[PDB]
Design a protein around this ligand. Structure first.
Ligand SMILES: O=S(=O)(O)OC[C@H]1O[C@@](COS(=O)(=O)O)(O[C@H]2O[C@H](COS(=O)(=O)O)[C@@H](OS(=O)(=O)O)[C@H](OS(=O)(=O)O)[C@H]2OS(=O)(=O)O)[C@@H](OS(=O)(=O)O)[C@@H]1OS(=O)(=O)O
Ligand SMILES: O=S(=O)(O)OC[C@H]1O[C@@](COS(=O)(=O)O)(O[C@H]2O[C@H](COS(=O)(=O)O)[C@@H](OS(=O)(=O)O)[C@H](OS(=O)(=O)O)[C@H]2OS(=O)(=O)O)[C@@H](OS(=O)(=O)O)[C@@H]1OS(=O)(=O)O
Ligand code: CA
Length: 437
């Protein structure tokens, strides 16, 4: 047993952590998601900032029982967050049982370590009848589009035919183009989408037929895009390769051998031998590798063992709640135990055959800077699209929505100050300064 990997505790004191990811800005911050509705920052020196990066625990409806999937579900940073400060979160909230929101946020202009809560911009609201099979994973592909993985919500045919106003998004991989200059809608539909300009099915839907998906593995590489998801109907533990336009109802898995939390594609630097592997794990820490045959394109699973090497250990506390990836590509376990309140932990996966810092893995921290995009500076009245288009609130216009509109116009030298509000010169009265005193 010389081929094993091992697990290194990085931080503890977390409250039900569900995942972790970086923001791609060079700062090597790791953002840890906590189920009740928090996002904490872990610095590359290993400190957790006191102030959460994002606190939406009052907006978030979370569940005390473990099988209750309600809470904060996923987070994705825009590929160009370093310049536009855009991020996307999915979470459950109250309004029949609850609503699954996908919302855009922008980091604050003054503080690169805190989101501006005022910049919430709702993209989707998906009705939910039950508290399982939710999904919620947000991710960006090499194409630059935003993918959204939704489970079936345990919604039956009778539930949907009877109750109108159910979203029809449940059970689907949605693909959005968030880089729009259009102001009438929060996102535009990619033309590559299979139901683009098609009245029969929602244009957002990229694929469907998902039931209870885990965290899906996303490969970056060099042809197109590969997304592998675990799914368990309810036992029925299958793994699916996501392709455009496919219906995965009664679809076999890539594997017959053999519930899984999810998986990841290792693109880190610390392990050479693991580079490019698809890895999936269950809640108890049993891990497997998926290898595709270049010849047949069939998939095969092999076990991946953990073993102790010094303080890099072959075991960890509690159950795996989620996975993480840092800006260097290394991967993490998020686990929690019952016990006290904050018994959640962040662990790193380590290849003990290799140094912790091989020469080629060195990378200089570029500390996070405040936004400098022209839009964020000057877009006073309205919101900025991820492209930098300043979208005016009603009653405003100009390149950055600085000039208010007055219809009819202010008279006698009056100034249009706010929408349809005229500041009159002394001696002139009325809503447009039209009456002479
Ligand atoms: O089936 S699983 O192995 O994936 O387990 C997940 C289910 O755990 C439940 C019910 O499990 S059961 O009692 O064994 O039928 O939650 C409650 O029980 C488990 C028992 O764990 S065990 O390893 O499956 O035996 C508790 O976990 S444990 O800490 O005792 O290991 C649950 O706590 S938790 O899942 O760790 O958060 C316990 O709930 S509670 O935290 O004590 O309140 C179901 O989850 S629950 O209903 O949300 O509590 C899960 O099954 S479900 O069908 O998805 O509901
Ligand atoms: O321990 S549980 O079996 O309760 O697992 C927790 C989830 O089970 C529900 C519904 O899930 S399901 O039945 O698997 O589809 O509760 C259901 O199970 C118990 C039976 O207890 S038992 O010992 O596990 O058999 C019922 O309680 S009882 O009245 O039979 O004593 C539940 O009734 S109720 O839903 O609480 O009203 C029964 O629901 S049902 O027969 O399917 O309608 C869920 O409980 S609930 O949602 O709180 O009502 C649990 O899922 S949860 O949504 O995460 O809470
Ligand atoms: Ca999930």
């Amino acid at each position: 047993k010389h081929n094993c990997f091992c697990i290194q505790e990085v931080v503890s004191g977390l409250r039900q952590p569900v995942g972790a990811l970086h923001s791609g800005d060079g700062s090597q911050r790791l953002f840890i998601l906590e189920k009740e509705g928090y996002v904490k920052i872990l610095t590359p020196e290993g400190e957790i900032f006191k102030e959460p990066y994002l606190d939406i625990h009052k907006l978030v409806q979370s569940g005390i029982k473990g099988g209750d999937e309600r809470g904060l579900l996923s987070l994705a940073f825009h590929p160009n967050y370093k310049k536009n400060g855009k991020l996307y979160v999915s979470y459950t909230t109250n309004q029949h049982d609850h609503i699954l929101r996908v919302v855009e946020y922008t980091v604050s202009r003054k503080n690169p370590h805190q989101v501006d809560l005022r910049t919430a911009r709702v993209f989707l609201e998906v009705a939910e009848l039950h508290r399982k099979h939710l999904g919620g994973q947000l991710l960006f592909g090499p194409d630059g589009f935003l993918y959204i993985i939704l489970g079936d919500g345990m919604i039956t045919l009778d539930d949907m035919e009877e109750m109108d106003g159910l979203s029809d998004f449940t059970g689907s991989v949605l693909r959005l183009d968030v880089d729009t200059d259009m102001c009438n809608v929060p996102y535009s539909i990619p033309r590559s989408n299979p139901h683009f300009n098609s009245t029969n099915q929602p244009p957002e839907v990229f694929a469907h037929g998902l039931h209870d998906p885990g965290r899906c593995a996303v490969d970056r590489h060099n042809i197109n895009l590969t997304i592998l998801c675990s799914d368990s109907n309810g036992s029925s533990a299958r793994i699916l390769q996501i392709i455009k336009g496919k219906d995965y109802e009664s679809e076999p898995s890539l594997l017959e051998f053999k519930p899984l939390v999810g998986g990841f594609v290792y693109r880190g630097c610390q392990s050479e031998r693991l580079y490019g592997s698809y890895v999936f794990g269950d809640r108890n820490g049993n891990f497997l590798t998926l290898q595709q045959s270049p010849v047949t394109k069939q998939w095969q699973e092999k076990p991946l063992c953990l073993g102790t090497s010094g303080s890099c250990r072959g075991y960890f506390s509690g159950h795996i709640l989620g996975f993480g990836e840092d800006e260097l590509g290394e991967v993490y376990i998020l686990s929690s135990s019952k016990s006290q309140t904050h018994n959640g932990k962040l662990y790193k996966i380590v290849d003990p055959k290799r140094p912790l810092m091989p020469e080629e893995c060195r990378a200089t921290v570029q500390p996070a800077q405040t936004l400098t995009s022209e839009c964020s500076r000057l877009c006073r009245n309205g919101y900025c699209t991820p492209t930098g288009k300043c979208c005016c609130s009603p009653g405003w216009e100009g390149d950055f929505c600085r000039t208010a509109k007055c219809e009819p116009a202010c008279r006698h030298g009056g100034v249009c100050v706010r929408p349809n509000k005229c500041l009159c010169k002394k001696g002139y009265l009325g809503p447009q300064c039209e009456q002479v005193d």
